[PDB]
């Protein structure tokens, strides 16, 4: 078995950054297989069908596609504000994962980071007082992995683009998550959409493709034709250009958003997120018997409510009811739990659970096919 | 129909840069589909764990280097290598290796982007080891050898090989890096094809870092693979640029499945579509062309990573023009031929499925 | 809330001791008792910061302390003496009713049983 081995994500995190983030749809898989097996018109520009599709969906003039959203932010800052100040709120200097920090990206991209306001309260006058002759951008970063609660104040995109129009300074956005549909319609927490930012007047909006979009690892920048053309002509773009499998997967995923009626079914990310809790309860009750019969004598397994995280691109707050299987040792020793976790991690198709509340939990929200999981766990 | 539509490459260029370069094997396709459909341990080591440690071990087994690094493409590989190993310092490159690939990649421009200073030595055709020696000073960070994959200078020429430059850098305490580009992992001369420099030879000769593509003569996905010294690779992985240049899980899955084909070379000419199309015999092409408007000898270009000289016999069917090509480009599966010698030629070297192709025409 | 990481006071004072740099804290609220005993959310205490090795801790007197508007800085004798001798201190010195209220309020914390 290889290291790029399939695993059954029972940790309750749908978009696990360490597990490949979003799963790909069957349409994306078929398009990718067709692109790999046979020659495709890659450059016979490279991303033009995708640019037109993003114009249809988001409503922006032009679009650029790069390796990932870190590459998107790097290219945006290097091709739009190289050698010039960029005004970012002091409460949006975000860190994602641990390798991506906004100040470090500003340093690499050759711009100067101008910090305004405070960590919790940033006012429009803080943006206004920093705009000078060296200022090239007003950059709003979407804090996708965290939220500040309490005495807070943030300037929305509409007010910031109004201020930039008044001061003749473009406004860009590092959206990150890139949810293309209103999640509130499915009961999920609402996240800002590229459509709203593009309509509000944001010059450039950069978002990921494997986050809430449900596609491949890609960095999608949508916005004004002139600034997108600036990005395309930058020397960095050649290093950051996207692969043909990436483009095929992104095109097939984006074509799913043209038919929203089946979107909750044909998109694995949405299908896993909007999965009802009653079906999870039924599946847990059905699966509770064979495991107890096989090796549940050492530690009993029962079904109680649990909480599941949406994953990357959303708040790490769970916010999602679900059902889980708990393996509670009889003698109350963590050695049994650690040994069981190691045994599962050494299986041909590893099953990853979570050590929560002194027990080993398997959250079945992200378990579509129970046959292979039952075979591996028996 | 989407613009990323299948196309039957009958132009004779197997590795067409504008047509996706190398087709991937069935093993790579299956690994990619498995990685897409199900979660994979991208950055979660079962034994946190790095993203491409399995790939690094596989590349150590194949090439023989200490460590490896995977980035978006070889342009990104060269950019990261120069920015993490020679930032703010001089890089000594022969004046006859300042290569341009495709049109968007240019060695001087990459050095400008990477923060290095390009030091050019020798002449376009004649570069001597003393030209390298006279340019090495306290600000020199690397001696860079770029493999001219898309061109060759013929006539009164002189190039310093990698062994001589490695010895010179060892004497002067300056590391030697190589932008191999093509990255052929097997001796092509064994298959009757022109020999190309291999990463194994450069690694054995003492090159600190060797960067090559994955969609060229390797036959895999678009990737930039840098193999070499553990310290140099660790410098690359810790650079801030790497986060922007890191490789996707589909890219890593395809690359690992492709690299595992090189562990069984006997079936490599069959499992690898690039090698299968390159080592396809001319008699079979002649038979297929006769079975499928005149059939005559033609010559097929290898494509990216090799010199654009044809150097490959084949048989092609000709249509005895512009409007025919325009009509063919509008099919659900477009057929692209070449307007050569006043005739429309369809080189049948890359035609793998006759039953499907015959339906459109 | 979310993907967060903060360096605690103990680790920071250890780092400052290693690098010979003092560590100060703007506590603000200045709760002198463990609020978790009363069912309210726990807040950092000046006692914990002083024990952990923080050179100076500044907190309000009208916030969670329950007294008058005052700024109370507690810590090392040398740095406190630096504060007292600063020219700003005359401008910032505390009033007599402020001191009376602060002393009477602090005397309540010596009898925690009736403090609630």
Curated annotation (Swiss-Prot), chain B:
Any one of the GO BP annotations: selenocysteine incorporation
Class of this enzyme: transferase
Pathway: Aminoacyl-tRNA biosynthesis; selenocysteinyl-tRNA(Sec) biosynthesis; selenocysteinyl-tRNA(Sec) from L-seryl-tRNA(Sec) (bacterial route): step 1/1
GO cellular component entries: cytosol
Residue list for modification N6-(pyridoxal phosphate)lysine: 216
Essential cofactor(s): pyridoxal 5'-phosphate
Keywords tagged on the record: Cytoplasm, Protein biosynthesis, Pyridoxal phosphate, Selenium, Transferase
Top-level taxon of origin: Bacteria
Family membership: Belongs to the SelA family.
Subunit structure: Homodecamer; pentamer of dimers. Binds only one seryl-tRNA(Sec) per dimer.
Compartment list: Cytoplasm
Record's function text: Converts seryl-tRNA(Sec) to selenocysteinyl-tRNA(Sec) required for selenoprotein biosynthesis. Requires selenophosphate as the selenium-donor molecule.
GO molecular function: identical protein binding; L-seryl-tRNA(Sec) selenium transferase activity; pyridoxal phosphate binding
Gene from which this protein is expressed: selA
EC number: 2.9.1.1
Reactions catalysed: L-seryl-tRNA(Sec) + selenophosphate + H(+) = L-selenocysteinyl-tRNA(Sec) + phosphate
Protein name: L-seryl-tRNA(Sec) selenium transferase
Swiss-Prot record, chain C:
Compartment annotation: Cytoplasm
Modified residues (N6-(pyridoxal phosphate)lysine): 63
Domain of life the protein comes from: Bacteria
Annotated function: Converts seryl-tRNA(Sec) to selenocysteinyl-tRNA(Sec) required for selenoprotein biosynthesis. Requires selenophosphate as the selenium-donor molecule.
Family listed: Belongs to the SelA family.
Subunit structure: Homodecamer; pentamer of dimers. Binds only one seryl-tRNA(Sec) per dimer.
Protein name per UniProt: L-seryl-tRNA(Sec) selenium transferase
Organism from which the protein derives: Escherichia coli (strain K12)
């Amino acid at each position: 078995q290889s290291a790029l081995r399939p695993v059954i994500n029972l940790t309750g995190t749908v978009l696990h950054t360490n597990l490949g983030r979003a799963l790909q749809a069957e349409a994306a898989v078929e398009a990718v297989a067709q692109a790999m097996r046979s020659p495709v018109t890659l450059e016979y520009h490279r991303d033009r069908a995708l640019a037109q599709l993003l114009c249809r969906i988001t409503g922006a003039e032009d679009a650029c596609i790069v390796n990932n959203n870190a590459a998107a932010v790097l290219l945006m800052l290097a091709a739009t504000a190289s050698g010039k100040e960029v005004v970012v709120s002091r409460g949006e200097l975000v860190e994602i994962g641990g390798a991506f920090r906004i100040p470090d990206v500003m340093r690499q991209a050759g711009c100067t980071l101008h910090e305004v306001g405070t960590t919790n309260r940033t006012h429009a006058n803080d943006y206004r007082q920093a705009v000078n002759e060296n200022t090239a951008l007003l950059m709003k970063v979407h804090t996708s992995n965290y939220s500040i609660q309490g005495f807070t104040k943030a300037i929305d995109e509409a007010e910031l683009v109004a201020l930039g129009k008044e001061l003749d300074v473009p406004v860009v956005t590092d959206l990150g998550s890139g949810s293309l549909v209103d999640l509130s319609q499915y009961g999920l927490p609402k996240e800002p959409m590229p459509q709203e930012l593009i309509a509000a007047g944001v010059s450039l909006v950069s978002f990921s493709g494997d986050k809430l979009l449900g596609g491949p690892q890609a960095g999608i920048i949508v916005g004004k034709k002139e600034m997108i053309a600036r990005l395309q002509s930058h020397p960095l773009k050649r290093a950051l250009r996207a692969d043909k499998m990436t483009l095929a997967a992104l095109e097939a995923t984006l074509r799913l958003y043209l038919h929203p009626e089946a979107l909750s079914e044909k998109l694995p990310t949405l299908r896993l997120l909007t999965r009802s809790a009653e079906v999870i309860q039924i599946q847990a009750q059905r699966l509770q018997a064979p495991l107890a019969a096989h090796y549940g004598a050492e530690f009993a397994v029962q079904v109680m409510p649990c909480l599941s995280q949406i994953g990357s691109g959303s708040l790490p707050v769970d916010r999602l009811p679900s059902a889980a299987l708990t393996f509670t040792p009889h003698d109350g020793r963590g050695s049994h739990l650690e040994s069981l976790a190691a045994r599962w991690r050494e299986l041909p198709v590893p099953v990853i659970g979570r050590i929560y509340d002194g027990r080993l939990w398997l959250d079945l929200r992200c378990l579509e096919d129970e046959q292979r999981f039952l075979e591996m766990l028996l």
